[PDB]
């Protein structure tokens, strides 16, 4: 149904702006809100309908000590929505404590559009992990929406901060926010900043203007995530229909990404299928095996070579799945998006559960253990002392995520019929 999108933090507001601008590009609408008279499809997936051929997008923007939000503000893409929801330290405790006091008025802004929304499906978080002001604030707000809404779904687009190195409180922030992510979020879409940096250095030879091209790749993935909903498909035209196959249990709810070109400056569906299997074409970087995969194709339709390709990816034997279960990689076909010029008319997308990210989690866990034992990297401010005098909540968070690592490794085994 309808989903209110929720952006906070500097990077998270950048992707919120970039996604909504890209959806303005995708639909036959002006950047001022006017729908075009030379336009079939739906332009009401996330948009409040005003009159002047105005579909006002249903997005709430949030800021804390704003720098980039002013540059977002002066834009012709600020006249599409902005129902006047602008409202004003780089630690987790900074964002957490500053969100603590002002939670009621921003939640009143939420309730405004909540009664404004006749239909609802979910809330999408545009988050950034270890973004400073976004950290703490986003986890606090996540706790509040979960506490207020046990009837709604939450999906979070969040970065995994790893750029091969300075901020020394980063594993602490990621540890606490991941604790809130595991137990207060229904859906997690994770990506590697290192892997996107790798693919950016693949397609070009840039090192300084990485951010804008990272915005290109993330907008492609975010548009591909919503193409089945924005354009009339047949299944996973809801969030929950897409989500339900992917999560076999809500400790395994972290989802992987894919985009089939490497460089975006006849190939059959088999080829993009078989290379969307490859980890050089996956945008997120013993044996790890997939727990469930779903793939999504938008482009040229060969009406029988789908099942022919299906038999082919079977007998190829590139990916063996979970032992203790009937786990399939599953096919979805959608319309390629009109109203915009497009290179690579065939484009693919994977959502999967894989056990490989437990390595990244134990990486952060080991770094946290090192900095916590070495004891110079909590950076001892008044925020952290008022939040916790004895600093045991971080220890509890490490305990819970270690338990989650144990659950991951036990799910990695062929036997996960017993608990743990």
């Amino acid at each position: 149904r309808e989903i209110i999108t929720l952006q906070l933090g500097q990077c998270g507001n950048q992707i919120g702006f970039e996604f909504w601008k890209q959806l303005c590009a995708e639909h036959g609408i002006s950047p001022e809100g006017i729908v075009e008279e030379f336009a079939t499809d739906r332009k009401d997936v996330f948009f409040y309908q005003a009159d002047d051929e105005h579909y006002i997008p249903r997005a709430v923007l949030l800021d804390l000590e704003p720098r980039v939000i002013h540059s977002i503000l002066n834009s012709p893409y600020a006249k599409l929505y902005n129902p006047e929801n602008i409202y004003l330290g780089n630690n987790w405790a900074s964002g957490f404590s500053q969100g603590e006091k002002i939670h009621e008025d921003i939640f009143d802004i939420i309730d405004r559009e909540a009664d404004g929304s006749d239909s609802l499906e979910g809330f999408v978080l545009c988050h950034s992990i270890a973004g400073g002001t976004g950290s703490g604030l986003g986890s606090y707000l996540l706790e509040r929406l979960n506490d207020r809404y046990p009837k709604k779904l939450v999906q979070t687009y969040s970065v995994f901060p790893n750029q091969d190195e300075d901020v020394v409180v980063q594993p602490y922030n990621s540890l606490l926010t991941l604790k809130r992510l595991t137990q207060n979020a229904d859906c997690v879409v994770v990506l590697d900043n290192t892997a996107l940096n790798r693919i950016a250095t693949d397609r070009l030879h840039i090192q300084n203007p990485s951010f804008s091209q990272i915005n290109q790749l993330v907008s492609t993935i975010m548009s591909a995530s919503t193409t089945t909903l924005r354009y009339p498909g047949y299944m996973n035209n809801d969030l929950i229909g897409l989500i339900a196959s992917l999560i076999p249990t809500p400790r395994l709810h972290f989802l992987m990404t894919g985009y089939t070109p490497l460089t975006t400056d006849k190939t059959t569906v088999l080829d993009v299928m078989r290379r969307l299997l490859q980890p050089k074409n996956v945008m997120v970087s013993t044996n790890h095996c997939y727990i469930a995969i779903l793939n999504i194709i938008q482009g040229e339709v060969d009406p029988t070579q789908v099942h022919k390709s299906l038999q082919r990816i079977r007998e190829r034997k590139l990916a063996n799945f979970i032992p203790w279960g009937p786990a399939s990689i599953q096919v979805a076909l959608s319309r390629k998006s009109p109203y915009l010029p497009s290179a690579h008319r065939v484009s693919g997308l994977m959502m999967a559960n894989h056990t490989s990210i437990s390595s990244l989690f134990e990486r952060t866990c080991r770094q946290y253990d090192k900095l916590r034992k070495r004891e110079a990297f909590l950076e001892q401010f008044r925020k952290e002392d008022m939040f916790k005098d004895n600093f045991d909540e971080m220890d509890t968070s490490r305990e819970i995520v270690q338990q989650l690592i144990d659950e991951y490794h036990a799910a990695t085994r062929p036997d996960y019929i017993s608990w743990g």
């Binding site: 149904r1 739906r42 239909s119 909903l229 009339p232 498909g233 047949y234 035209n237 809801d238 229909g241």
Partner: protein, 48 residues
């Protein structure tokens, strides 16, 4: 000639395309209400 004036103006194929669009987004909302009945209760849901 007869085929021409039966595919435009009393055009069959549009009615048929609509038929296979009455099954097969919009119908998600439609189905979910029926799942949890009356013959007019379906009618008000269809007419919106």
């Amino acid at each position: 000639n007869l085929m021409q004036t039966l595919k435009k103006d009393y055009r069959l194929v549009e009615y048929l395309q609509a038929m296979r669009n009455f099954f097969l987004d919009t119908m998600y909302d439609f189905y979910t209400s029926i799942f949890d009945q009356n013959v007019s209760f379906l009618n008000v849901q269809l007419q919106e």
